[model samples]
Target: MSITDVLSADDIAAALQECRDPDTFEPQKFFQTSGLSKMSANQVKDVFRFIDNDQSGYLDEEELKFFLQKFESGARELTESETKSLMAAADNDGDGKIGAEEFQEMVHS
Candidate 1:
């Protein structure tokens, strides 16, 4: 998934179905769609659940923001440009903003 590609709401929803809770609750429940990677749907599902700290059905802005904060609390120092580049990368959708769905795509991919 290139950063330049335009992912739609339906695309996000489709990905969400692969995301599951620790207890094995899929976010979008059971709508199965093939993902970009050769990864089996189940493999991708566990990955999503692994990152979703709050276990919310859908990752919201606040949860994503907290998630973003983790990048800065790293083991090694990052250059200013690297930090800027990371922020720019998250600014997908060409919207100059970041949201939960966008973060999910980033997290999974």
Candidate 2:
């Protein structure tokens, strides 16, 4: 299916709405709504690059903290607890960060 089939423009707009409030923003929900789970490996890599921000090839805590902004420009940052939860879920190497490979796996798995 095409990317639009996975996540229509309307769906993305709705997902962006969720990002408006940091207190209510959920990465898991955004992931599902934004169709990241259905994206191709290469497409997920593009997302990884965008979220990596500093271009360090990995998503450190700081980047993870601001994960929502990668999706919606006006989104608020993830709380420390949220960032830690995301890190624990995605950091397969125990390196306290997520590399491109790890991110791809997380999105696809």
Candidate 3:
């Protein structure tokens, strides 16, 4: 649900070690790049598994609804049309389900 869920204490510590500026570093993007590089594959998978409540290989619109609903700091329910639109955008192949590859591309995008 948060960054901690995707990173270990050691990973967090490691990321923090790289957080400080060494003169030439820009302060603006330290928090972004340094932290992401520390995440483990399993940690990232946990998020996908969490959102895919039914343990289905892909995320359907129903699952995405829960994802959007709980993604924000507070629960923000997406409209029916909005959910469909999101799935459509992510489902590049237009398949009914959002496969891991598609999901990966979605996140990266």
- For model 3, residues 1-84, the per-residue Cα lDDT tens digits are 454454443443543455332332222232234343234545445656666778878787777778634334322224555355
- The TM-score of candidate 2 is 0.70
Per-residue lDDT tens digits of candidate 1, residues 1-109?
3211322234435433453222332322222332323344454455445435678654444444443233223311133333234334545666545544554454345
lDDT, residue 47, candidate 3: 58
Candidate 1 lDDT score at position 8: 26
Model 2 C-alpha lDDT versus the unseen true structure: 0.68
Mark the 10 consecutive residues where model 1 has the least summed lDDT.
68-77
TM-score of each: 0.30, 0.70, 0.52
Q: Model 1 residue 18 lDDT? A: 50
Predicted structure 3, TM vs. truth: 0.52
Highest TM-score, which number? Answer: 2
Model 2 is weakest, by summed lDDT over 10 consecutive residues, at 1-10
- Collision count of model 1: 0
- How big is the positional error of residue 20 in model 3, measured in Å on the Cα after superposition? 34
Shift of residue 95 alpha carbon in model 2, Å = 2.6
Query: Clashing residue pairs, candidate 1?
Result: none
lDDT for 89 (candidate 2): 66
